[PDB]
Design a protein around this nucleic acid. Structure first.
Ligand SMILES: [Ca+2]
Ligand SMILES: [Ca+2]
Lengths: 367, 367
DNA sequence: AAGGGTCCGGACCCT
DNA sequence: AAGGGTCCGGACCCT
């Protein structure tokens, strides 16, 4: 499908929001601490040595100047996330969210309208905004190249708007599919954008050194592949489809092999309003007594403020537990009286607990 | 919630469609045969002795005049079903479908608009269309009674339209919830309608003799209840909520006990377009060889015509098997090339079969 | 960590 | 029979 897909990857999001919140934090190594880990850091801290998911103490030693603002409360990050998605939705309605820092948009229709409102007497001037992957030559005669070049311009527009309206810096990637767009978005990582012309897809797919770097292949699938002997993209591309279907399933095998060739027909989805609101707390086997009710109590109060703000209402509640040894869950439709609050809720949640390192409450079935 | 819900139950649907298809079949005992069973019969055959789900031969003996048109192809029944749902949707958009003979509609908004466009100087004339359950007295002073009486009139309008436009006879039931509406729709069964006023809900709930007659309680739940000793509605109403939650689950226990009191907050849903298209064939251990591919082949061709007609397209395929001994299933996303046909499809379906009295093919994930 | 999303196969219900 | 629908808990993915 001749599609133009854009991937928007914001740089150090949690940190960028914290730096905007306290100007002083600007031009200073900043790390976002979650429990015992530094989940995100500014480029300055990365430069001095701080890395993602690093022990906080090791970091403050490698970077004694590391100011560490806590980020276990994701409320302000979530607010800016939806502000970014909303700006992008004004450009085109269908925006898919991946986490809070990434967004996908299909610019195909927008590209076509701009290309029709144009005259071929100005085609020699359709110019690229940003880097072209593999310094590939542009052919202003190939329609595909022109469409992707228009997407490059819309991406530059989206990025300038995100800075001018939300003060946020980010990277962009324009391609024919979501996989290629996400993979090209980080070729130039600090506040830059890259477009992948069709004749350079194989260079990007073979640029990867681990199959886990392919979006869609995680720990389990990769372990299965490594055991079959597949450690390269070419290995997955050249492996027998039949054996892979037999050991992984027809669905996973066909999709993952297509990804090895840079093929993804996945439609860009409209994520729209959130479908779940959850809150959790991590602990060191600190829950060995039904006193875990106290933890569930705190989690409920916090999540309650969030569901109050949305306006839509929850109809199913879920308790997710993490034992030390893999997360089990038990859900129940919320009684209507409660839908119209803590004591009834804790009673239901405790019954779910009794039927079943981490405790989580989730409000789903939102209407 | 002060709601007005209507249940539309068409009389002997399959048979009514067959009688419309062959006028001659009118005023003659008619039975719809499916394999070895008579799934539906006209009232004339019911009068002579024919019953639902009866051996065809036993029926043709009790009623030697029974003309039996085959109804294993549900295409014409399905077409009339959506014609009925569409007529009802013109009255109000939210229409829920239960099978092909039943529809639920929320008339609350319609009732309110008509009641506002009315003057209290004409309230003494709001009259009921159809029977009132338990010959309950109408109180034109209770707003609830007035709202349900308006629903009675809209139901009579819907029924007259179904006869005048589709030549179909049916029964209707107006109440505050879907359970009470479905339960009151059949008090007067031949082409009649009944309204349940609020002070008569307990009479209807206690009118039932088996808890399985309660919509929502099937074989499994009823067996569990019978083992706990619950065989009456009063038994379920008076049983300990706690023990029921322990043996059946918090969700089922709370909902089924509310149903025992005639309580159902279930929202009337807009069923809208179909979400699945399936075809199956029942056989006497006639599939003991991979030759079952031949059966899957026929099923596919048939279902293909149906998916061609819808206009929306399938994205996931499912193979459902019934062994003699409980239906297992294996699904796979359909390759995009096929989505844009028999040989590729049978190959995927055979792989699903090899991974796994009845064989069924289902086209779901429709977009 | 601290969230958040689809897919899937079964159980159960209904006609 | 011959269809058709939600609920659910887990696996797996992503940030
Ligand atoms: Ca980064
Ligand atoms: Ca009947």
């Amino acid at each position: 499908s001749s599609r133009v897909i854009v991937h928007v990857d914001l740089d150090c999001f949690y940190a960028q929001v914290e730096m905007i919140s306290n100007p002083e934090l600007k031009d200073k190594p900043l790390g976002v601490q979650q429990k015992y880990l530094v989940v995100t850091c500014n480029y300055e801290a990365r430069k001095l040595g701080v890395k993602k998911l690093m022990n906080v103490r090791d970091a403050k030693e490698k970077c004694p100047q590391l100011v560490l603002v806590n980020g276990e409360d994701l409320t302000r990050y979530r607010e800016m996330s939806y502000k970014v998605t909303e700006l992008l939705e004004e450009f085109s309605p269908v925006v898919e969210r991946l986490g809070f820092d990434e967004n996908f948009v299909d610019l195909t229709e927008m590209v076509e309208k701009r290309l029709q409102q144009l005259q071929s007497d100005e085609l020699s001037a359709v110019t690229v905004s940003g880097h072209v992957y593999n310094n590939q030559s542009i052919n202003l005669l190939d329609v595909l190249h022109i469409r992707l070049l228009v997407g490059s311009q819309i991406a530059a527009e989206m990025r300038e708007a995100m800075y001018n309206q939300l003060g946020l810096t980010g990277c962009a990637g324009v391609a024919s599919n979501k996989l290629l767009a996400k993979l090209v978005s980080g070729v130039f990582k600090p506040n830059q954008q890259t477009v992948l012309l069709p004749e350079s897809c194989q260079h990007l797919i073979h640029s990867l050194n681990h199959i886990k770097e392919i979006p869609g292949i995680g720990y389990k699938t990769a372990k299965c592949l490594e055991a079959l002997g597949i450690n390269s993209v070419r290995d997955l591309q050249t492996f027998s489809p039949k054996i892979l279907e037999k050991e992984l399933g027809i669905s996973v095998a066909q999709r993952i092999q297509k990804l090895s060739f840079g093929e993804d027909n996945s439609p860009v989805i409209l994520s729209g309003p959130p479908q779940s609101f959850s809150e959790e707390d991590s602990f060191k086997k600190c829950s060995s007594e039904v006193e875990a009710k106290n933890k569930i109590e705190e989690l409920l109060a916090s999540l309650l403020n969030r569901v109050c703000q949305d306006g839509r209402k929850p109809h199913t509640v879920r308790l997710i537990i993490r034992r030390y040894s893999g997360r089990e869950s038990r859900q129940c439709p919320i009684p209507s009286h409660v839908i119209q609050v803590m004591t009834p809720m804790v009673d239901i949640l405790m019954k779910l607990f009794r039927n079943m390192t981490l405790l989580s409450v989730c409000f789903c079935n939102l209407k």
